[PDB]
Write a protein that binds this DNA or RNA. Structure first.
Length: 287
RNA sequence: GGUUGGCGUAGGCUACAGAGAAGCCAACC
């Protein structure tokens, strides 16, 4: 497995020792392992925040501030999704980010890399305030409009004649507290993750989990149809993909595809669909 | 191709909300 072919971290992992020598705010959070190598404890929210903020500055020229009480996005995963959206839409382009988080990372990356315009929505006060500040401090307010909404949905007032090229979304993966704790395992001694989940409740849980959340997005798409060229959603769980493709098929959606986002050990998936007859459909990963 | 059971990440491996994932084994259709 490999990251997306255009992902700048493919076969080029960041050099933590180089980053620590150049960025004192990163060096503050590193550890030295028993090989004498600069390393990170990815279970420490401050360390992973420092890494993400430092990568965005050094590699993308973006300065962001984010809280420890909300999700800390990881750059290679988010880039894998941006590059897949480039493939979908055939890369002025306009997108919608549903639930943009405190980092506003998808709009910041898309506007910086490709000059895309974004409508970026958020339901959480803390995430909304940080997202607005991160857009403003990177001088991207002309390209990115951050809006506070009551629900994560495509059926918004901010939408009437502008046709969007795409939507993207990181849906809340989990339906309940046992799922969010990761304890639904065959064996109690299953190794724990190397990461930590700092997400807020509206970032990580939803009624019915990502399966029911994405079904609601699908039913929103059945009302909007051609208002957006491509609909897309990340999936945190492999077992969500088949039931969601079958929901699209039962509802008669003509064009459907999917992909895998590969980075580290944690895989993510994503689903995309369209009602247009013109668009080319990117192939899913080979069998 | 599929279904079911078993195994599978403790970072002396640079993560990616670990998805029991990537994989591996057996058996049955």
């Amino acid at each position: 497995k490999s990251m997306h072919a255009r992902n700048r971290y493919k076969d080029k992992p960041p050099d933590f020792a180089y980053l620590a020598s150049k960025y004192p705010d990163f060096k503050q959070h590193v550890q030295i392992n028993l090989n004498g190598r600069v390393s990170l404890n990815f279970k420490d929210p401050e360390a992973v925040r420092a890494l993400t903020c430092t990568l965005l500055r050094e590699d993308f020229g973006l300065s962001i501030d984010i809280p420890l009480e909300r999700l800390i996005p990881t750059v290679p995963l988010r880039l894998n999704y941006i590059h897949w959206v480039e493939d979908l839409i055939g890369h002025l382009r306009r997108g919608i980010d549903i639930g943009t988080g405190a980092s506003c990372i998808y709009p910041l990356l898309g506007a910086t890399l490709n000059g895309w315009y974004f409508l970026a929505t958020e339901v959480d006060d803390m995430c909304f305030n940080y997202a607005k500040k991160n857009v403003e401090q990177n001088n991207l307010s002309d390209l990115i409009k951050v809006v506070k909404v009551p629900q994560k949905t495509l059926l918004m007032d901010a939408l009437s004649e502008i046709i969007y090229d795409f939507c993207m979304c990181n849906p809340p993966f989990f339906a309940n507290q046992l799922e969010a704790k990761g304890v639904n395992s065959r064996n109690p001694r299953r190794p724990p993750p190397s990461s930590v989940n700092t997400g807020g409740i509206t970032e990580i849980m939803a009624e019915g989990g990502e399966l029911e959340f994405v079904k609601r997005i699908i039913h929103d798409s059945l009302q909007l149809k051609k208002r957006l060229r491509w609909y897309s959603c990340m999936l945190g769980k492999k077992c969500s993909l088949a039931p969601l493709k079958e929901e699209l098929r039962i509802q008669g959606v003509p064009k459907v595809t999917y992909t895998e986002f590969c980075q580290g050990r944690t895989m993510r998936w994503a689903l995309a669909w369209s009602f247009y007859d013109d668009v080319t459909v990117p192939s899913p990963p080979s069998k």
